[PDB]
């Protein structure tokens, strides 16, 4: 689904 | 019989928790104001309570020994499916069996059955959620057991969508055997009695609540006028 903000909070 | 690795793991998770759970709940001000008067009057505030808790949970997950060795895609799957469960678990800290409410600071940020009700989830969820809170409370976990359980929940192999489930399992196992062992060395009887099995059972109660929650989420969110009251992070995490 490509999760921008979750991805950003994990990095 | 707690190895030095295992004391390490518990050190990390206590600190990880402390860094991501402010027990003065001071940020609850940046949340849209709560409203108890009342057609889904609570939805904006608690939507913001959840979105925030999502952030804090992610912040706890990243520090989980081993979580980093996972792929970004697996990290995604695990967080997306545990988020609400870990929120139910960590919420136990503010929940009190005095009046069956989550007491965060006070009144204006003290939440209760009718409050929760007023945000768009029925009693098909709330009743068993409270039950859950009562049973988890009564185990009186050591805080070390608290944070180990939250981490174990996040790092679950069987979550749909997982790729390297095998390496997921190894990170969880390390945490499990850490919990099993801690309970033996540090949890005195009678509190110790079958404590692990009673904790693993809370994980199953959590799946059921989640399933109920994911169903009633699809309900609120099919009405755009409701979907429009949420935050973007909540939209993204609870599937959009
Ligand atoms: C810092 C803390 C911890 O993070 C948790 C905490 C309190 C934790 C609490 C008490 C209040 C109710 C909470 C959050 C339950 C939740 C499932 C039910 C929510 C009602 C629902 O209608 C609202 C939704 C509806 C859609 C869209 C949007 C997002 C979701 C899905 C929720 C708004 C679970 C834990 C409960 C305070 C403090 O301990």
- For B98-123, give the DSSP string: TTTEEESSSGGGEE-HHHHHTTT--H
CA B49–ligand 1 middle distance (angstroms): 6
CA torsion through residues B230, B234, B235, B240, sign: negative
Chain B CB contacts of A9 under 8 Å are: 55, 58-59
Chain B CB contacts of A7 under 8 Å are: 72, 76
Classify the phi-psi angles of B101: left when phi > 0, otherwise alpha if psi is within -120 to 50, otherwise beta.
Answer: beta
Bridge-based pairing of strands B101-103 and B110-111 is antiparallel
**Residue B36, domain extent:** 1-240
Compute how many other C-beta atoms are within 10 angstroms of the C-beta atom of residue B28.
Answer: 17
Q: Name B194's Cβ contacts closer than 8 Å, sequence gap at least 6.
A: none
Distance CA B62, CA B86 (A): 14
CA distances from B172 to A11, B19, B120, B167 (A): 21, 22, 34, 9
Distance CA B155, CA B76 (A): 11
Helix (H/G/I), strand (E/B), else coil: B95: strand
Q: How was this structure determined?
A: X-ray
Distance CA B217, CA B226 (A): 10
Please choose, from the candidates B234, B91, B68, the residue with its C-alpha nearest in 3D space to the C-alpha of residue B150. B91
Helix (H/G/I), strand (E/B), else coil: A3: coil
CA B122–ligand 1 middle distance (angstroms): 13
| Ligand 1 atom at shortest distance from the alpha carbon of B52 | 4
Is residue B78 a contact partner of residue B61, using CB atoms and an 8 Å limit? yes
Is residue B167 a contact partner of residue B69, using CB atoms and an 8 Å limit? yes
Q: What is the CATH number for B232? A: 1.10.565.10
Please choose, from the candidates B47, B55, B137, the residue with its C-alpha nearest in 3D space to the C-alpha of residue B101. B137
Alpha carbon B50 to its chain's center: 10
Buried b (16+ CB within 10 A) or exposed e, B171-206: bbebbbebbeebbeeebeeeeeeebbeebeebeebb
Domain count for chain B: 1
Identify the bridge partners of residue B110 per DSSP, sorted by sequence position. B103
Nearest CA to ligand 1 atom 2: B91
Identify the bridge partners of residue B96 per DSSP, sorted by sequence position. B101
Which tokens go with B161? 């969508």
């Amino acid at each position: 689904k490509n999760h921008p903000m979750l991805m950003n909070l994990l990095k | 019989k707690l190895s030095e690795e295992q004391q390490h793991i518990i050190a990390i998770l206590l600190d990880a928790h402390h860094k991501t759970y402010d027990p003065t709940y001071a940020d609850f001000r940046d949340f849209r104001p709560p409203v108890r008067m009342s057609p889904l009057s609570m939805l904006p505030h608690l939507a913001d309570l959840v979105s925030y808790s999502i952030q804090k949970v992610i912040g706890f997950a990243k520090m989980i020994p081993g979580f980093r060795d996972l792929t970004s895609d697996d990290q995604i799957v695990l967080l997306k499916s545990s988020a609400i469960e870990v929120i139910m678990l960590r919420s136990n800290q503010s929940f009190t069996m005095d009046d069956m409410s989550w007491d965060c600071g006070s009144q204006d940020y003290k939440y209760d059955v009718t409050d929760v009700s007023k945000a768009g989830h029925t009693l098909e969820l709330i009743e068993p959620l409270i039950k859950f809170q009562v049973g988890l409370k009564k185990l009186n976990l050591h805080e070390e057991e608290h944070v180990l359980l939250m981490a174990i929940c996040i790092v679950s192999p069987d979550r749909p969508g997982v790729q390297d489930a095998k390496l997921v399992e190894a990170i969880q196992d390390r945490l499990s055997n850490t919990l099993q062992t801690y309970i033996r060395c540090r949890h005195p009887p009678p509190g110790s009695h079958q404590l692990y099995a009673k904790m693993i059972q809370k994980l199953a109660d959590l799946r059921s609540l989640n399933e109920e929650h994911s169903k009633q989420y699809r309900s609120l969110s099919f009405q755009p006028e409701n979907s429009m009251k949420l935050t973007p992070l909540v939209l993204e995490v609870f599937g959009n």
